[PDB]
Amino acid sequence: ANFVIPYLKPVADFWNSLCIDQHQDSLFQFKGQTGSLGTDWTSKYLRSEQDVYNHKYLQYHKRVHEAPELTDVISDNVYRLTLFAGVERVLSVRQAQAILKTQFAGATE
Amino acid sequence: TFGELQTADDYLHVLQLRSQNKWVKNYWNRSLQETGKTNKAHVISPQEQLR
């Protein structure tokens, strides 16, 4: 708790953020009412389960109408750039393979 | 006095009537006003109509 948990807990928090619905969880954090109906757990759950598609629509609306942002585009094309970025190199090598001597070092055409 | 259960029941329906009246008045007032909910009580959960 003094030497390991301060380092292990952030990893678990990141894991939960990737796994748990963040908007719904944040909505559930503020439990109580301040003079309005529909702020209880049931109404918050219902709006949160309707808020997934609304949030998708809002993200698409921001991408289409407002000025584009680099983070939004990158996250929209995250698999081409982060995980399968080496497939681009593979395709480039395949295209250039006809004159690239790779046939003479443990590789086929 | 012949205590056949029908004649005895004729004797005892008045006392049962008064006891039932007392019980039912107490039931109505205390039990129903303190426990029951009238006119289709229900819990309302509003949702905003999203964009």
**Of B45, B49, B51, which to mutate for an interface test with A (greatest number of A Cβ within 10 Å)?**
B45
The answer to whether the CB of A66 falls within 8 A of the CB of A78 is no
The C-alpha of B40 sits at a distance from chain A's nearest C-alpha, in angstroms, of 19
Which residue in the block uniquely carries the two structure tokens 């109408």?
A: A65
The C-alpha of A12 sits at a distance from chain B's nearest C-alpha, in angstroms, of 33
Q: How far is it, in rounded angstroms, from Cα A78 to Cα A85? A: 9
Structural determination approach: cryo-EM
CA angle (B43 as vertex; B39, B44 as ends), nearest 5: 105
The radius of gyration of chain B from alpha carbons, rounded to an integer in Å, stands at 24
3-state SS of chain B: helix, strand, coil percent to 5? Answer: 60, 0, 40
Burial class (CB in 10 A: 0-12, 13-18, 19+), A44: buried
3-state SS, residue A24: helix
> Cβ of A58: how many Cβ atoms within 10 Å?
13
The number of C-alpha atoms within 13 Å of A55 and in the hemisphere containing its C-beta is 10
Chain A residue numbers with beta carbons less than 8 Å from the beta carbon of B51 are 54, 57-58
3-state SS, residue A65: coil
Tell which phi-psi region holds residue A31, choosing left (phi > 0), alpha (psi between -120 and 50) or beta. beta
> Cβ of A54: how many Cβ atoms within 10 Å?
15
Q: By C-alpha distance, which of A27, A35, A30, A79 is closest to A54?
A: A27
3-state SS, residue B45: coil
3-state SS, residue B16: helix
A63's CB contacts (< 8 A; 6+ apart) are: A72, A76
Phi/psi for A40 (5° steps) reads -80, 180
